[PDB]
């Protein structure tokens, strides 16, 4: 095992054994189990100890394997990051010379590169840190030396270009969060001044040098630099011309040249139009040279290798970006019209590529073009831009219809300790893709609705006669047809959908076999669901569709029933009104007929389909406006499940032990699920059904609670794996879901509070408190949370009872550690936020000890790791502070008792790395606190210093706290930081960046103005900020 040899690596009292260190480092990457565990542990401990110099200066020399030298470089980078400005200048110069010597020795050994590529890269990174901390003043000649060494030889020039790339990255793209704002500004200014010296070396190596590795490295460097290069160098030189001519038309340079051209095109300046025009023209010429207009781009991509695919994608990116940015310019340039059309054809061909990313990239520009054209004029198909683009739109529409992401997204998920359901996704990547395609297609239809009609008709007919028959094609065409909905005037929609339905029914009759029949059934069922506007004008057709759906729900073939139920509910939602009225030529509203047949329609559907169908019916009932008719409707509507409910209730009354019968529990769960869906759909009037079962519902909930608690006691947590336990927990969750849902839908808060609320407090809260912690139901808290959210103040009186019931027992679950019972934490803090935001006076009334415990809970909240919990805690705290501003009577006492502790806790959290996510909330809270302080509040936070204005005592207190936390900070640092807090009080973004800046400094053993403080610069920034917040 060799742990006895291993633990010596931390023995810093003796010289390092380079051989053993290298062996352990290599075994890390070639070890397992305890070997890897303790290896990484020892290495991490080793990297932390102070004597890093003795270890580095030895590893980099006597290390055999490369990764060991890499680890030594990592240690030295830690040293350079932490203790740089406090090293003796002797060691500073020694380190600088040692690293530059190592770099020169390693880089020039071969002509361009060696197996040290990672090792030389990390050497470059070390030198880049040194440069970050020493460049603008201690090495005012480094840039000139780099340029000279570059001109001297290529084995130095390539590595110098790598160095420059790394430095430009670190200085212009990765500064925030790792370098102070003022230091970053200084470095960027220095680079702006020193670029040209680099630029001429770049131009030399680009136009005269011919070492392909070197030129590729230079192109990468230019790409990176382009993110910030002053535009004078870019557009006012020959750089674009050189790129296009000498590097876009050779396999190993075209990728990088195209990336650079893309970055150049993305610029949005207005006075560089001619440079853009020339760029586009030359680029198109070159593209025609390498990529002819008639190439089979799709086959090329499928068969092509990484380079070809990357070139295709980057061609797409360049075209899309340049067009989105300046296409109007070329469109105005008459002579280039042919090139414009050729570029459009390029993007057409690329669009055929089967890669999703490339298709999305092209679709982005397509959507932009369509939206721009629609804005140009809202009327359908003369507008100038539209007049120009018209010829392409035909192919655009053809592609849009041939390819169309499926709108649906259905998944099978198992939850509740083993219960499987079906779920739908809202805005995953695929759904967004479909949304973009649909939006573009709708715009295009608004342009040429007639052409869309013709294309869709032709594709459908092609499916009919078997010429293009294929399930994939049929589904895609149906999704495309559904994509447009109301896109055309309802008369044209009438004609188009009539034709489509006739053709689809004809195809259904023509084909045969269960598979084809099922596919076509799903297809038409989808199409109809997406056209409620047509259905609401054709009562006969709507009735026929509903009847056919009823017929389908008896089908046993998989897929038919689920789609049938989904279509039925979709139709009910958008057509609820017509089912509850007598249509022309009808005797009774169609709802009445449906209700009478509920018995047999669902005779074959599985429980989930049953719930969905009941939800659809409920949606249908809600449209009813007559209260008495609605009540009769609801009575008959819930008649059926109520019978089983009452039977089970009577059986339980005869003997409650039936509740341990799994079948009865499952039936109860199904009944409650049905009721939940009905409550969701019907809305407030559903109370009539609720009252009929409220009391026995709560009673059975209590009985199941008792049963589950006893089972857990006798068997422990493991018994939750028992399906019976799963079933009771189901029943409970669904009961709570019903109650919370109805309360959400209810709109008579006083009636709810005085009728339905107290029974919960009786039979749920004390239950929760009594239950063993493991079996306590987290959803319990959410119900009261929603009840409070809806009732507002009307529930205030019972807040103390609710809290005495649940609050004390909840915290003991979530105070021992940060991890366990997360759902409990989320629900509890949601409840607390609701109470604070709506029932604040309750907090004033409860004993001060309870309020103290609440504040402790809030602090524990925003001290958590999970970002949601922390954000909830911070929001609760901010709302609490806001509210207390009105309770002036107790406001002063609350300040005196908690303000200093809260401020301490906020600074504690901010000064920690694991909570940068809530930086904005921290800034807001601190700004509010300091506004309270400075603007003036009556009391004084410290009795001995009663005459001492808080504006001074708090400054001193916070300075002392920061010093205690971080001794190595210079007094000037802390004093400036605290003064800025007041100065940056009203400029919340400035306050946030100031907090981040301070967070940067604490990580380093900063020096005594040793290139870190820039005190005079900060003074000017803060003093005007103090003036800024002043006015």
């Amino acid at each position: 095992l060799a742990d006895h040899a291993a633990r010596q690596l931390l023995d810093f009292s003796q010289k390092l054994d380079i051989n053993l260190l290298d062996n352990v480092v290599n075994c890390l990457y070639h070890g397992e189990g305890a070997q890897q565990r303790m290896a990484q542990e020892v290495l991490t401990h080793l990297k932390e100890h102070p004597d890093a110099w003795t270890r580095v200066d030895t590893i980099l020399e006597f290390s055999q394997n490369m990764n060991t030298k890499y680890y030594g470089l990592q240690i030295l980078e830690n040293v350079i990051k932490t203790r740089w400005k406090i090293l003796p200048r002797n060691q500073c110069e020694g380190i600088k010379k040692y690293v530059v010597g190592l770099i020169i020795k390693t880089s020039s050994d071969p002509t361009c590169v060696e197996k040290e590529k990672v090792y030389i890269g990390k050497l470059n990174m070390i030198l880049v840190q040194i440069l970050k901390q020493e460049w603008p003043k201690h090495w005012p000649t480094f840039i000139s030396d780099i340029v000279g060494a570059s001109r001297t030889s290529e084995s130095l020039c390539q590595n110098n270009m790598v160095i420059l790339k790394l430095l430009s990255e670190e200085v212009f793209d990765f500064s925030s969060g790792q370098i102070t704002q003022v230091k970053s500004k200084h470095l960027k200014d220095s680079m702006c001044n020193e670029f040209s010296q680099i630029f001429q070396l770049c131009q030399f190596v680009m136009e005269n040098s011919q070492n392909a590795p070197l030129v590729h490295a230079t192109l990468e460097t230019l790409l990176r630099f382009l993110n910030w290069i002053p535009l004078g160098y870019i557009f006012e030189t020959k750089l674009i011309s050189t790129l296009i001519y000498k590097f876009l038309n050779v396999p190993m340079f075209r990728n990088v040249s195209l990336k650079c051209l893309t970055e150049i095109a993305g610029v949005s300046v207005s006075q560089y139009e001619e440079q853009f025009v020339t760029l586009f023209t030359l680029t198109m010429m070159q593209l025609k040279q390498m990529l002819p207009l008639n190439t089979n781009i799709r086959l090329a991509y499928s068969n092509g290798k990484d380079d070809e695919q990357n070139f295709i994608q980057n061609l797409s990116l360049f075209l899309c970006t340049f067009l989105k940015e300046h296409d109007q310019l070329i469109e105005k340039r008459l002579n280039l019209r042919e090139t414009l059309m050729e570029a459009l054809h390029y993007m057409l061909l690329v669009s055929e590529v089967e890669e999703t990313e490339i298709f999305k990239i092209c679709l982005e520009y397509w959507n932009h073009l369509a939206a721009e054209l629609y804005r140009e004029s809202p009327f359908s198909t003369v507008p100038p831009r539209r007049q120009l683009y018209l010829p392409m739109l035909f192919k655009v529409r053809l592609l849009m219809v041939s390819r169309m992401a499926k709108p649906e997204e259905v998944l099978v998920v198992e939850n509740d300790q083993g219960e499987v359901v079906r779920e739908f996704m809202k805005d995953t990547d695929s759904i967004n893709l479909y949304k973009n395609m649909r939006e573009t297609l709708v715009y295009l239809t608004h342009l040429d609705y007639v052409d869309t009609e013709r294309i869709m008709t032709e594709k459908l007919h092609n499916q009919v006669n078997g010429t293009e028959w294929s399930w994939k094609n049929l589904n895609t065409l149906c999704w495309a047809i559904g994509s447009i909905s109301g896109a055309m005037h309802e008369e044209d929609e009438k004609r188009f959908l009539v034709t489509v339905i006739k053709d689809l029914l004809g195809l259904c009759e023509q084909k045969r076999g269960k598979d084809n029949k099922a596919i076509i059934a799903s297809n038409i069922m989808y199409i109809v669901g997406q056209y409620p506007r047509f259905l609401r004008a054709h009562w006969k057709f709507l009735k026929t569709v509903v009847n056919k759906l009823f017929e389908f729900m008896h089908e046993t073939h998989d897929g038919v029933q689920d789609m049938a139920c989904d279509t039925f509910i979709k139709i009910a939602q958008k057509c609820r009104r017509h089912f509850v009225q007598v249509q022309v030529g009808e005797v009774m509203p169609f709802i009445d007929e449906i209700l009478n047949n509920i018995n047999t329609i669902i005779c074959d559907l599985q429980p989930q389909q049953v719930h969905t169908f009941y939800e659809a019916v409920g949606y249908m009932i809600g449209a009813q406006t007559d209260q008495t008719v609605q009540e009769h409707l609801i009575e008959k509507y819930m008649l059926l499940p109520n019978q089983v409910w009452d039977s089970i209730i009577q059986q339980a009354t005869k003997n409650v032990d039936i509740l341990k019968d799994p079948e009865t529990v499952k039936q109860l769960g199904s009944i409650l699920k049905t009721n939940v869906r009905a409550c969701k759909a019907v809305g407030h009037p559903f109370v009539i059904q609720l009252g009929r079962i409220y009391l026995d519902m709560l009673n059975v909930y209590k009985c199941l609670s008792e049963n589950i608690s006893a089972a857990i006691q006798a068997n422990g947590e493991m018994v939750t794996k028992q399906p019976l336990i799963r079933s009771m927990r189901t029943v409970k969750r669904e009961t709570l879901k019903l109650i919370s849902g109805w309360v959400s839908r209810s709109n008579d808060p006083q009636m709810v509070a005085e009728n339905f609320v107290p029974p919960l407090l009786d039979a749920v809260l004390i239950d929760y408190q009594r239950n063993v912690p493991a079996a306590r139901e987290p959803e319990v808290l959410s119900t009261m949370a929603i009840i409070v959210n809806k009732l507002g103040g009307h529930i205030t009186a019972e807040i103390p009872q609710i809290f005495d019931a649940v609050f004390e027992c909840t915290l003991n679950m979530i105070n021992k550690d940060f991890e366990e019972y997360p759902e409990h934490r989320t629900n509890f803090f949601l409840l607390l936020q609701a109470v604070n935001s709506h029932c604040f006076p309750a907090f004033l009334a409860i004993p001060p000890t309870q309020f103290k415990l609440v504040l402790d809970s809030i602090i524990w909240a925003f001290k958590h790791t999970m970002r949601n919990v922390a954000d909830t805690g911070l929001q609760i705290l901010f709302t609490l502070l806001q509210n207390v501003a009105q309770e002036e009577a107790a406001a002063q006492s609350f300040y005196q008792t908690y303000f200093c502790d809260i401020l301490q806790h906020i600074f504690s959290v901010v000064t920690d790395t694991s909570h940068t996510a809530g930086l904005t909330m921290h800034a807001s809270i601190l700004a509010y606190m300091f506004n309270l302080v400075e603007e003036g509040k009556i009391s004084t936070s410290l009795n001995p210093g009663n005459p001492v204005n808080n504006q001074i005592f708090l400054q001193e207190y916070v300075a002392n706290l920061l010093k205690s936390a971080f001794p190595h900070l210079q007094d000037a640092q802390v004093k400036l930081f605290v003064t800025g807090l007041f100065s940056l009080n009203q400029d919340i973004p400035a306050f946030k960046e100031h907090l981040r800046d301070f967070l940067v400094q604490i990580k380093e053993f900063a020096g005594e103005d040793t290139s870190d403080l820039f005190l005079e610069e900060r003074e000017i920034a803060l003093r005007q900020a103090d003036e800024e917040k002043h006015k």
């Binding site: 990484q40 991490t44 990764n67 990765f174 998920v413 996704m425 991890e819 970002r867 996510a917």
Partner: protein, 170 residues
């Protein structure tokens, strides 16, 4: 026989350990046990062209419990840079992890996975994940517990690595 290694990167609170735990044993985990250092998890897959195995390395995404930082990446042939769609900041840190990765890798196959799309509060709006494009990265919307797209990252990595565009799991 074929063998590789895999390193996971991405700031904490984005499901780095849950993916590997699920693929190893299949059942979800809720507790946010912060990862320490790196854990070696031997992993296996079966395909139409046989079995391929990943030695998965789980790098903690917390600055306070990370360990060796980039040194873990030295021998890796593939990695997933993951974040969370619900936590916007986790996305803003993706470029930082990408940089820290490439500098020690030769543009190896890397997949960007946006976790926790099952949550209905999609703070990280789609239509604003354009970064993965310009770095030739393969992007997947994923979820550890709902299993949405739960196999696409591994499948795509296997296709690009073993070198067989017809590869498929079974």
């Amino acid at each position: 026989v074929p063998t590789f290694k895999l390193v996971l990167v991405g700031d904490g609170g984005t499901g780095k350990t849950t993916f590997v735990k699920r693929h190893l044993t299949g059942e979800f985990e809720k507790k946010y046990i912060a990862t320490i250092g790196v854990e070696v998890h031997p992993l296996s897959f079966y395909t139409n062209f046989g079995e391929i195995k990943f030695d998965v390395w789980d790098t903690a995404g917390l600055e306070k419990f990370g360990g060796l930082r980039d040194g873990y990446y030295i021998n890796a042939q593939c990695a997933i840079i993951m974040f969370d769609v619900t936590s916007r900041i986790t996305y803003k840190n993706v470029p930082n992890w990408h940089r820290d990765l490439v500098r020690v890798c030769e543009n190896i196959p890397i997949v960007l996975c946006g976790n926790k799309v099952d949550v209905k509060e999609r703070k990280v709006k789609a239509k604003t994940i354009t970064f993965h494009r310009k770095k030739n990265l393969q992007y997947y919307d994923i979820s550890a517990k709902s299993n949405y797209n739960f196999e696409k990252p591994f499948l795509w990595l296997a296709r690009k690595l073993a070198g067989n565009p017809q590869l498929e799991f079974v």
